[PDB]
Structure formats: structure tokens, C-alpha cells
Amino acid sequence: HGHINDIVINGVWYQAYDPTTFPYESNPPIVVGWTAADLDNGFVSPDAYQNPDIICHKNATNAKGHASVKAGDTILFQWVPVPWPHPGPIVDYLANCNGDCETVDKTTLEFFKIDGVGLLSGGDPGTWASDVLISNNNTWVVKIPDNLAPGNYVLRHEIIALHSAGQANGAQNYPQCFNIAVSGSGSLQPSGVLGTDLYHATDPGVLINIYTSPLNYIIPGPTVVSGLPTSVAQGSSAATATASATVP
Ligand SMILES: *[C@@H]1O[C@H](CO)[C@@H](O)[C@H](O)[C@H]1NC(C)=O
Ligand SMILES: *[C@@H]1O[C@H](CO)[C@@H](O)[C@H](O)[C@H]1NC(C)=O
Ligand SMILES: *[C@H]1O[C@H](CO)[C@@H](O)[C@H](O)[C@@H]1O
Ligand SMILES: *[C@H]1O[C@H](CO)[C@@H](O)[C@H](O)[C@@H]1O
Ligand SMILES: *[C@H]1O[C@H](CO)[C@@H](O)[C@H](O)[C@@H]1O
Ligand SMILES: *[C@H]1O[C@H](CO)[C@@H](O)[C@H](O)[C@@H]1O
Ligand SMILES: *[C@H]1O[C@H](CO)[C@@H](O)[C@H](O)[C@@H]1O
Ligand SMILES: *[C@H]1O[C@H](CO)[C@@H](O)[C@H](O)[C@@H]1O
Ligand SMILES: *[C@H]1O[C@H](CO)[C@@H](O)[C@H](O)[C@@H]1O
Ligand SMILES: *[C@H]1O[C@H](CO)[C@@H](O)[C@H](O)[C@@H]1O
Ligand SMILES: *[C@H]1O[C@H](CO)[C@@H](O)[C@H](O)[C@@H]1O
Ligand SMILES: *[C@H]1O[C@H](CO)[C@@H](O)[C@H](O)[C@@H]1O
Ligand SMILES: *[C@H]1O[C@H](CO)[C@@H](O)[C@H](O)[C@@H]1O
Ligand SMILES: *[C@H]1O[C@H](CO)[C@@H](O)[C@H](O)[C@@H]1O
Ligand SMILES: *[C@H]1O[C@H](CO)[C@@H](O)[C@H](O)[C@@H]1O
Ligand SMILES: *[C@H]1O[C@H](CO)[C@@H](O)[C@H](O)[C@@H]1O
Ligand SMILES: *[C@H]1O[C@H](CO)[C@@H](O)[C@H](O)[C@@H]1O
Ligand SMILES: [Cu+2]
Numbered sequence: 084h085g086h087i088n089d090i091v092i093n094g095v096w097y098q099a100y101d102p103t104t105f106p107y108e109s110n111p112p113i114v115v116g117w118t119a120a121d122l123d124n125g126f127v128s129p130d131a132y133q134n135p136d137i138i139c140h141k142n143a144t145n146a147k148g149h150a151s152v153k154a155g156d157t158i159l160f161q162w163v164p165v166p167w168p169h170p171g172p173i174v175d176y177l178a179n180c181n182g183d184c185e186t187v188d189k190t191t192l193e194f195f196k197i198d199g200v201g202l203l204s205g206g207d208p209g210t211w212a213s214d215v216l217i218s219n220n221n222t223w224v225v226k227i228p229d230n231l232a233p234g235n236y237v238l239r240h241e242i243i244a245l246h247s248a249g250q251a252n253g254a255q256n257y258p259q260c261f262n263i264a265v266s267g268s269g270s271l272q273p274s275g276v277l278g279t280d281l282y283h284a285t286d287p288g289v290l291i292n293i294y295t296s297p298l299n300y301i302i303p304g305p306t307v308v309s310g311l312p313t314s315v316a317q318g319s320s321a322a323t324a325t326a327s328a329t330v331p
Pocket of ligand 4: 305306
């Protein structure tokens with residue numbers, strides 16, 4: 084259980100959507116994170132993998148502004164509370180909004196995977212991407228590909244928790260969506276997968292007992308786009324300035 088508090092893009096801090104705070108406010112701010120109904124810091128289960136909730140979390144509605152970034156920039160995700168409690172993989176996707184992300188229909192977004200880390204070593208439980216996130220003060224770093232075509236994209240970051248995944252419907256997915264506007268020199272525009280086609284309840288990395296050794300792990304979802312590292316070097320860094328979500 085947790086949620087993202089902020090993202091830091093080359094040192095520039097943005098307030099994320101806070102489902103533990105904003106729903107209680109009269110007039111919550113416009114932010115780069117989508118509005119969602121994870122007030123309990125909870126998850127989407129496999130029985131909702133074919134439901135709109137898996138796209139950007141429960142009942143999600145579009146963030147009403149965006150963060151402008153350059154292709155090649157790195158984005159740090161800050162999860163709270165510290166520490167994240169569960170073992171599992173971490174993945175990141177982009178989907179072109181084909182227009183403003185503030186008004187895109189989320190059910191049309193076709194996600195391509197830009198990073199994904201699973202089981203790093205061992206078993207029962209082993210060391211996972213989540214352990215790296217915990218070590219780095221509850222952060223994960225993704226790089227927007229240097230050659231990504233200019234456009235507006237939803238960035239879908241997700242931790243999957245596997246401590247209860249040995250049973251049907253036991254995996255727990257924690258997607259978090261953000262609006263970005265990307266500038267750059269490249270033309271990369273990878274083939275994506277609809278959110279409700281990403282995962283199935285019987286996938287080998289979804290229905291899995293991690294309390295066994297030796298252990299292997301197939302990260303769910305499509306391949307990381309060719310030519311991208313499956314992760315860039317992890318490590319937390321501080322923000323040096325703050326910005327607000329830019330409205331169209
Ligand atoms: C999501 O929306 C549905 C439809 O209105 C509602 O019944 C449900 O309570 C909402 N979920 C949460 C967690 O608020
Ligand atoms: C670790 O991250 C949490 C959540 O953002 C923050 O409250 C805390 O100050 C961070 N630790 C340091 C040393 O910055
Ligand atoms: C510090 O470094 C991290 C890792 O590159 C960035 O994500 C962050 O925005 C800041 O520049
Ligand atoms: C490009 O590749 C993706 C899978 O990675 C497909 O979902 C898409 O239809 C296209 O063939
Ligand atoms: C996944 O499921 C959704 C319905 O929840 C469809 O809109 C989508 O095309 C895909 O089949
Ligand atoms: C797990 O197995 C089911 C069939 O039992 C498939 O539909 C699913 O795509 C996954 O391969
Ligand atoms: C638990 O399951 C793993 C397979 O993931 C085996 O390698 C191990 O021997 C035990 O049966
Ligand atoms: C889990 O434990 C098994 C015991 O055989 C090891 O082989 C494996 O490398 C992992 O540590
Ligand atoms: C991941 O990589 C495979 C092979 O390059 C593609 O077919 C897929 O569409 C995704 O980019
Ligand atoms: C995947 O495909 C790309 C594009 O051809 C290569 O750059 C990469 O080395 C891998 O074969
Ligand atoms: C992403 O995945 C690849 C292939 O499993 C690793 O080699 C890389 O270090 C990262 O974990
Ligand atoms: C991306 O990050 C993962 C987790 O630290 C590493 O295992 C990988 O080699 C790459 O640096
Ligand atoms: C990651 O951790 C560092 C401290 O090591 C913080 O400065 C940063 O804000 C993030 O929480
Ligand atoms: C604060 O300073 C850092 C390091 O100079 C920058 O990365 C950031 O964009 C802001 O200017
Ligand atoms: C801008 O303000 C944010 C919070 O609004 C900080 O976290 C950041 O360090 C900078 O002072
Ligand atoms: C940019 O705009 C947002 C929304 O009004 C503020 O939360 C932020 O402090 C800055 O003024
Ligand atoms: C939204 O986009 C504007 C540029 O159009 C930036 O100035 C702002 O910091 C935010 O990223
Ligand atoms: Cu939890």
C-alpha cells in the first residue's frame with residue numbers, strides 16, 4: 084500500500100495526486116497525476132485487469148495539467164509512506180494521447196513499456212525491484228527515451244506486489260498515471276497495448292509463488308521497447324525547484 088506524493092523531473096518537483104488528501108478538500112489543485120479513488124492506498128486486483136480501473140487506478144479521471152519534459156530527461160517517483168511494504172516488480176509505460184492528455188479517453192490509450200525490473204536474485208522471497216525502491220528512500224527513476232517522438236503522453240508507473248500472488252486474484256497492482264508533454268529530436272513511436280489487454284490473472288508473473296527457491300520471474304505485460312535499458316541507474320536525488328502542472 085502507498086501512493087505517489089511527487090515526481091521530480093531533472094530536479095523540478097511536481098505535486099502528484101494525493102488520494103489520501105485531495106478527496107477531502109473542497110477545491111483540490113490541478114496536478115500532473117490523475118485523480119483516482121485509491122483513498123485507502125490500495126490496489127487493483129486481477130479480477131479488474133479487464134476493467135478500466137487497471138489503466139490509471141480506480142475510477143481514474145484525467146489529470147487537468149501536465150509536466151513539460153525533454154526526451155532524455157529522468158523522472159523520479161516518490162512513494163509514501165516510507166517504506167513501501169511489499170515484494171515485487173516495477174514497470175513504466177507511455178501512451179500517446181494523440182492530443183491533449185487532459186481530455187484523452189483513457190480506454191483508448193495504447194501503452195508501450197519503457198522499463199521493467201523484476202526478480203533481481205534469489206527466492207523465498209528473493210530481492211526485487213521493490214527492494215531497490217525501498218533502499219532509495221522509496222523512489223524509482225525512469226528515463227524518457229532520448230529518441231522519443233515529440234507528443235503528449237500518459238506515463239503509467241506501477242508497482243506490483245506479489246506477497247499474496249500465489250493464489251488466484253492475489254497479485255496487487257498499484258498503477259499511477261501522469262501527464263507529460265515531450266519535446267525532442269527523435270521519431271520513436273513504439274507499438275502499444277491497451278491497458279485492459281496488458282495483464283491476465285493466469286500470467287506467469289501474476290499467479291506465482293515467490294516463497295520457493297530457486298525462482299525465476301517473467302515480468303507481466305509487453306516487452307520493453309527495443310534499444311532501451313530495462314532500467315537506468317537507480318538512486319534518489321533532491322529537487323532543486325518546484326513547478327506546477329501546466330494547463331492547456
Ligand atoms: C468508483 O465509482 C463507482 C461508480 O460510481 C462507485 O460505486 C465506487 O464507490 C467508486 N469507488 C471508490 C473506491 O470510491
Ligand atoms: C524520504 O522520502 C520521504 C517522502 O518523500 C521524505 O518525507 C523524506 O524527507 C525523505 N528523506 C530524506 C532524507 O530526504
Ligand atoms: C536527481 O537525479 C534523479 C536521477 O537522475 C532525477 O530523477 C531527479 O529529477 C534529479 O535530477
Ligand atoms: C505493436 O506491438 C504491440 C505489442 O508489443 C501490439 O500490441 C500492437 O498491436 C502492434 O502489433
Ligand atoms: C480491455 O477491456 C476494455 C473493457 O474494460 C476494452 O475497452 C478494451 O478494448 C480491452 O478489451
Ligand atoms: C493464463 O491462462 C489463461 C487461460 O487459462 C489465458 O487466457 C491467459 O491469457 C493466460 O495465458
Ligand atoms: C518452489 O517452486 C520453485 C519454482 O518456481 C522451485 O524451483 C522450487 O524447487 C519449489 O518447488
Ligand atoms: C533460494 O534457495 C535455493 C536453495 O537451493 C537456492 O538454490 C537459490 O539460489 C535461492 O537462494
Ligand atoms: C517489445 O519488443 C518486442 C520485440 O522488439 C516488440 O515486438 C514489442 O512490440 C515491444 O516493442
Ligand atoms: C531492438 O531493435 C532495435 C531496432 O532495430 C535495435 O536498436 C536493438 O538493438 C534491438 O535489436
Ligand atoms: C531489466 O531487465 C533486464 C533483462 O532481464 C536486465 O538485464 C536489466 O539489468 C534490468 O533488470
Ligand atoms: C536498472 O536498475 C536495476 C535496479 O537497481 C538494476 O538491477 C539494473 O542493472 C539497472 O541499473
Ligand atoms: C530520495 O532520497 C533522497 C535522500 O537519499 C532525498 O533527497 C530525495 O528527496 C528522495 O526522497
Ligand atoms: C535546481 O538545480 C538543479 C541542479 O542545478 C537542476 O537540475 C534543476 O533543474 C534546478 O535548476
Ligand atoms: C519547491 O516546493 C516543493 C513543495 O511545494 C518542494 O518539495 C521543492 O523542494 C521546492 O522547494
Ligand atoms: C503552481 O500552481 C499550483 C496550482 O495552483 C500550485 O499548487 C503551485 O504552488 C504553483 O502555484
Ligand atoms: C508545464 O509546461 C510549461 C511549459 O509549457 C512549464 O513552464 C511548466 O513548468 C510545466 O512543466
Ligand atoms: Cu499493501
